[PDB]
């Protein structure tokens, strides 16, 4: 259950509040009855409220409006930028940082024993959030061979076997495998080739990944309020 709570504003009236919220002034008597208010409902200052603190409310006192409010179906335009940042952060999850020391496991991508946990510098375990989290998960999936992870046959990639010849065919195989691996992630809305080239031994390519938009993540997290889990089991 959730309800709206209104702070009394300067020289406000109960009729104005009723019109503002219920869309009709007629509910002002219901508002009085629910809040248990005596006749001078909104006193000028606290000196009047001292006469009867129980039954009177002054400026800056909080009223309760029993309208069933719900965090979903709320216009994203009202939400504050920091609130949107936190919401997308929750949507994309928090996880322990393992992709630290990028250079090392970039020098040995195909091998095992390549990544490890790290500390945040404050004596606690390091954590990656939001975009850093997505980076970590996409790197780990691409680096993981498919079928090597226990309890998860399909998680991973087949790039360890695509160390083939230097022709456009193997390039296309790599590209298709990478697109499969990126598509496998639920959060990745789509992925597509940008550009590739061959330099004899070395292959080089780059991709573009569109994560779910702020609106979708906001809708998902605010929907999750009904359950209260606020966690990711994808």
């Amino acid at each position: 259950m959730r309800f709206k709570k209104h702070v009394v504003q300067h020289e406000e009236t109960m009729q104005a509040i009723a019109q503002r919220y219920y869309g009709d002034v007629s509910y002002w008597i219901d508002l009085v009855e629910h809040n248990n208010l005596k006749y001078p409902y909104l006193v000028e200052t606290d000196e009047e409220k001292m006469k009867d603190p129980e039954r009177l409310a002054s400026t800056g006192d909080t009223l309760i409006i029993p309208i069933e409010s719900d965090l979903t179906d709320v216009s994203a335009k009202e939400i504050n930028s920091r609130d949107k940042d936190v919401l997308v952060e929750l949507a994309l999850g928090r996880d322990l940082n393992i992709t630290a020391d990028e250079k090392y496991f970039n020098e040995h991508g195909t091998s095992d024993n390549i990544l490890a946990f790290s500390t945040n510098g404050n004596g606690d375990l390091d954590t990656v959030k939001g975009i850093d989290n997505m980076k970590q998960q996409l790197q780990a999936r691409l680096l993981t061979p498919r079928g090597s992870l226990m309890l998860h046959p399909n998680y991973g990639s087949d790039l360890h076997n695509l160390f083939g010849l230097n022709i456009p065919e193997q390039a296309t195989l790599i590209e298709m495998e990478v697109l499969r691996t990126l598509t496998s992630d639920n959060r990745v809305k789509s992925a597509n080739l940008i550009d590739w080239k061959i330099q004899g031994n070395v292959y080089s390519g780059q991709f573009s990944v569109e994560i779910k938009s702020v609106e979708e993540s906001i809708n998902f997290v605010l929907g999750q309020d009904e359950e209260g889990i606020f966690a990711l089991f994808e």
Partner: protein
Amino acid sequence: QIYESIDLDELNENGIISIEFVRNRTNTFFRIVDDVTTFNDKSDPVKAE
């Protein structure tokens, strides 16, 4: 204080920021009248605003 429409006009003409009481608006009962600076050369828009 609740400054009147003449007091607000005097404060803004003197390059002073002020807040005016306002009734029954959707958000709050107050708003900012202007974003003027102390430099009172209203002809110069860079310095004034």
